[PDB]
Each structure stands twice: as structure tokens, then as C-alpha cells.
Design a protein around this ligand. Structure first.
Ligand code: K13
Lengths: 99, 99
């Protein structure tokens, strides 16, 4: 679809068999989701945003469907203010900016 | 044009007579620029993201040119690590997400 930006570009995602709402965030290199349980191994990492750095759990090769489009990639889980879909997954679903 | 998301969507902007590089960020509600000495009145504001909040100065009806596309609206100024074009101005240049 074509998404205009007069509202937050929020979409429904499916991860770990659970539905959630997430923000399509072209300013995020990485995808960061709010606290949740995901199966499989994980490793501790740090990520920085506008206000500083947070501790997150890095999950690799995670299946995640974004607005009907499938992706498999890295998902960081931690105390982010909102679920954000970053470029590592936006590229997989063929997402571009157009003006 | 069309911008893919393999790399950060950085473009040249013109503000206050200065050329800068800024991120086209669908995840940012409002434009926030690195510290600069704009004239005029302003109002304090705090904006939150990953890591917490930063204090910024809100200027209204600031003219910005983004890739030859003119816009005018709110520009926040503060200690952001990156210049960020937010939705408040991305709408004014006709920018959409497409996949
Ligand atoms: C609450 C939604 C989202 C987190 C808001 N952010 C925009 C977002 O695009 C930032 C914009 C941003 C980019 C780079 C440094 C700091 C902020 N990106 C970001 O935090 O991404 C992180 C996850 O991937 C990594 O790549 C970038 C940092 C990591 S923000 O910077 O904090 C922001 C909040 C309010 C306004 N008006 C303008 C910007």
C-alpha cells in the first residue's frame, strides 16, 4: 500500500504467533519491540536513541510479518517507548520513501 | 524521487540560510534539528524516544527546503545526535511510504 504521514504509520505485525501494533520508522536502523517473551537463544546488546542508550535482548533470524509481508531478521526487545520497525526489516518488505 | 532504505535516508535541507544533512524519519512526529542559533521566539519542550527525553526549543512557522521541496512548520532545536525531518514536514513535501 501507499501510506501517507498525517498520522503515525502504525501497522499490525505478527511475531511469535502474537499480533501487535508497530510503527514503521525509517529513522531506525534496527527493529525494537516492547518487552515480550520470544523462544530461542538471545544475547544482550545496547542501543542508543535520542535520549540515550538502553539494554535490549537481541533475537536473530526471527520470523515477523508486517502488514501482510513476511520478513526474517534481527529483533531487539527492551524498554522502547513503542514498537518500531526499522530499516533492517523495512528493506525486506520492499519499503521505500517516495515524494 | 524514490529512496530505498538500504542506508539511512539522509538528504540535504536548507534552513535559516544553512545547508544541512537530515534524516527523513517517518517515526518522528516532529522535526528536530541539531543545536543551532535560530532567531525569534520559542517555547520549551521535551520529546521522548529510546533512552528517555531531551529538552528542545520549539520554533513555529520555520521555512525548510527539503530536496528542493519547500515546507514551513514547527522545527525543534536541541541536543539531538542527528538532524531529523519528521512527519509534520514530510506531509508538506508529499512524502509517502510504499510497499
Ligand atoms: C518513539 C518513536 C521513535 C523512537 C521516535 N524517534 C524517531 C526514531 O526514528 C529515532 C531517530 C533517531 C536516529 C538516530 C539517533 C537518535 C534518534 N530512531 C531510533 O531511535 O532508532 C534506534 C533504533 O535503530 C537504531 O538506528 C537509529 C537509533 C537506533 S526519536 O528520535 O526519539 C523522536 C521523538 C519525537 C520527535 N518529535 C522527533 C524524533
Amino acid at each position: 500500500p501507499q501510506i501517507t504521514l498525517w498520522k503515525r504509520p502504525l501497522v499490525t505485525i505478527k511475531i511469535g504467533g502474537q499480533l501487535k501494533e508497530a510503527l514503521l520508522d525509517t529513522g531506525a536502523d534496527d527493529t525494537v519491540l516492547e518487552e515480550m517473551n520470544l523462544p530461542g537463544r538471545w544475547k544482550p546488546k545496547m542501543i542508543g536513541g535520542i535520549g540515550g542508550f538502553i539494554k535490549v535482548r537481541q533475537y536473530d533470524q526471527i520470523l515477523i510479518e508486517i502488514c501482510g509481508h513476511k520478513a526474517i531478521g534481527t529483533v531487539l526487545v527492551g524498554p522502547t517507548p513503542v514498537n518500531i520497525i526499522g530499516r533492517n526489516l523495512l528493506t525486506q518488505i520492499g519499503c521505500t520513501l517516495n515524494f
